[PDB]
Design a protein around this ligand. Structure first.
Ligand SMILES: [Zn+2]
Length: 72
């Protein structure tokens, strides 16, 4: 898969209420998304996207479009 950096203040809207948004991204793109553990201090969190390259790129694009729509 691929690693997408997410600004810390925006992680909430990528995951969504009770993980609804990360479920919708997984469901629409057909991928698995997990956040890498970090020490909590870092300005970005890393979303690890697992799957074939095309699906991973579609999931990365969906996450990008979310972030851009709120200027993250
Ligand atoms: Zn787009």
């Amino acid at each position: 898969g691929i690693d997408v950096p997410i600004p810390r203040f925006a992680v909430g809207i990528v995951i969504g209420r009770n993980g609804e948004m990360i479920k919708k991204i997984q469901n629409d793109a057909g991928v698995r998304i997990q956040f890498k553990p970090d020490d909590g201090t870092t300005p970005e969190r890393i979303a690890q996207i697992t799957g074939p390259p095309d699906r991973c790129q579609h999931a990365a694009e969906i996450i990008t479009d979310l972030l851009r729509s709120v200027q993250a």
